[PDB]
């Protein structure tokens, strides 16, 4: 509940909706710039530091064997904390294609506070999921092993039903649950009858043996359901086993942003309530060993713009710090392209 306005550098224009903020050891990094990578920064990933509410998008370099990657506009990202690394799946390259690669991003070396990433390309073998965006991925541990759960999002029509009067129409992918092994690149689908409708832009929390799926949009009936789901996974020495459950007391949100304010307690901020109604309230969720609860916190102060605008976007910075953006008026005294804001909860 601490809002602040942020001044920007000169290359403000490299922020589009759907970036990703990779957080390494307190340092914050920007991914998903607008347009293909220029010659000011040939990699397309930015060092993103903010001092005195003034931020500086500095370049970053790669390793000797890294895989130079396209700027994805809506991927799924997860924090695989086993060295620390990030996992990027899917997304939407600026030629409006969709990718189906796994990008593994870690730090090679950091000298003189100047980082040097590396990123490798892992391609799944087996029951590979179809390329999509807006989905979610989460790494979960059990019995000394780790698997990446993946719940699907929306995508294009398959390559036989695409007509070029409706070439750019999207439909939700089939609501299975994919399980991914990273060390060998394996995939496994799981069909389960408790998940019926397609879901996109939902929120996914991962507490140490189970993943909670909350909110989301469903394109089959253009409704935003309120029902959350709990997914329990265990991999034995044999084949892994997945279970779902519908728990009561959820909420209806889509494209919300959720971060970790304390140990085992998360907070979620404004996505969208209805197709015209933004969500100004915020909700704190309290985790546990087996039980959670969702309560509403004290609905913080908004400025004239964030009360008055039509859309927003943003993500979290890592230390409980939400980055947000606002379009801003065009019919004005030549107002800027975007306004930016920082929310703190400490």
């Amino acid at each position: 509940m601490s809002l602040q306005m942020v001044t920007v550098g000169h290359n403000i224009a490299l922020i589009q909706p759907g970036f990703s903020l990779m957080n390494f050891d307190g340092q914050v990094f920007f991914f998903g710039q607008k347009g293909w990578p220029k010659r000011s920064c040939p990699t397309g990933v930015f060092h993103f530091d903010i001092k005195q509410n003034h931020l500086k998008l500095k370049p970053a370099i790669f390793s000797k064997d890294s895989c130079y990657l396209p700027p994805l506009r809506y991927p799924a990202t997860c924090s695989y904390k086993g060295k620390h690394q990030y996992i990027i799946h899917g997304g939407k390259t600026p030629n409006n294609e969709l990718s189906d690669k796994i990008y593994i991003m870690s730090v090679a070396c950091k000298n003189n506070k100047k980082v040097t990433f590396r990123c490798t390309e892992k391609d799944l073998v087996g029951d590979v999921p179809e390329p999509r965006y807006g989905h979610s991925i989460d790494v979960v541990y059990s019995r000394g092993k780790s698997m990446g759960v993946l719940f699907g999002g929306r995508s294009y029509m398959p390559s036989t039903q695409r007509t070029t009067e409706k070439w750019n129409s999207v439909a939700d992918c089939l609501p299975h649950v994919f399980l991914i092994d990273f060390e060998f690149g394996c995939a496994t689908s799981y069909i389960l009858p408790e998940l019926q409708d397609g879901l996109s832009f939902h929120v996914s929390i991962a507490r140490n043996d189970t993943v909670y799926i909350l909110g989301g949009h469903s394109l089959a009936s253009n409704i935003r359901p309120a029902n959350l789901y709990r997914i329990r996974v265990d991999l034995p020495l044999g084949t892994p086993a997945v279970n779902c459950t519908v728990l009561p007391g959820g909420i209806s949100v889509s494209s919300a942003i959720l971060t970790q304010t304390n140990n085992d307690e998360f907070v979620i901020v404004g996505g969208y309530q209805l197709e015209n109604q933004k969500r100004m309230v915020c909700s704190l969720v309290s985790l546990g060993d087996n039980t959670i609860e969702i309560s509403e916190m004290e609905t913080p102060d908004w400025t004239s713009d964030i009360k008055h605008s039509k859309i927003w976007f943003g993500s979290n910075m890592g230390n409980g710090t939400i980055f947000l953006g606002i379009p801003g008026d065009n019919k004005q005294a030549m107002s800027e392209a975007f306004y930016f804001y920082t929310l703190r909860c400490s």
Binding site: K34, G35, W36, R39, F62, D65
Partner: protein
């Protein structure tokens, strides 16, 4: 320059164009049906648009030619002996080389290896030169060499940027005096 919107609109047209390159259109032409087969050449692009959608570095690069692969420090020594070796599929596989990075080397020599290709090209275009913007560019270039030769730089170089506005003024004043050519900022054809 809004690259995502431009690809979002021009993608179905390239889908239809790539469809109708292996087909025959049968259609009546005055009674009896006739059969048509098409050959597409995409040529009418200016230098900025042909540099963007074919996936090159921008026009102020170290790499100048959309048709060949020589730097501008290689042009001024061998002026006329070049060839034409920038196709479309070659640029597509060079982007694939840039994305994969299979030889495990840094950006400063990977960019030299792929000859400045740093995006995915998405329109099949043929390499050619224009005719309009070429003539306007040559016009402005030796107009600038006229303004240079007034100030006699071959005797002594590097006068500062206060002689030059006087050189411009004496040039267009003299040429308006003789030819009645009004001084125009944006040069036309």
């Amino acid at each position: 320059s809004d690259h995502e919107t431009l690809t979002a609109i021009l993608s179905p047209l390239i889908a239809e164009r790539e469809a109708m390159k292996s087909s025959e259109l049968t259609l009546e032409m005055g009674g009896i049906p006739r059969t048509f087969k098409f050959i597409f050449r995409g040529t009418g692009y200016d230098e900025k648009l042909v540099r963007e959608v074919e996936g090159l570095e921008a026009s102020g690069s170290v790499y100048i030619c959309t048709l060949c692969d020589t730097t501008r420090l290689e042009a001024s020594q061998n002026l006329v002996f070049h060839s034409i070796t920038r196709s479309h599929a070659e640029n597509l596989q060079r982007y694939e080389v840039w994305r994969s990075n299979p030889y495990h080397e840094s950006v400063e020599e990977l960019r030299d290896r792929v000859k400045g290709v740093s995006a995915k090209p998405f329109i099949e275009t043929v390499p050619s030169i224009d005719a309009l913007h070429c003539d306007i560019g040559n016009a402005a270039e030796f107009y600038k060499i006229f303004q240079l030769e007034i100030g006699e730089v071959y005797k002594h170089p590097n006068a500062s940027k206060e002689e030059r506005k006087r050189w411009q003024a004496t040039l267009d004043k003299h040429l308006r005096k003789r030819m009645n050519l009004k001084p125009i900022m944006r040069m036309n054809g």
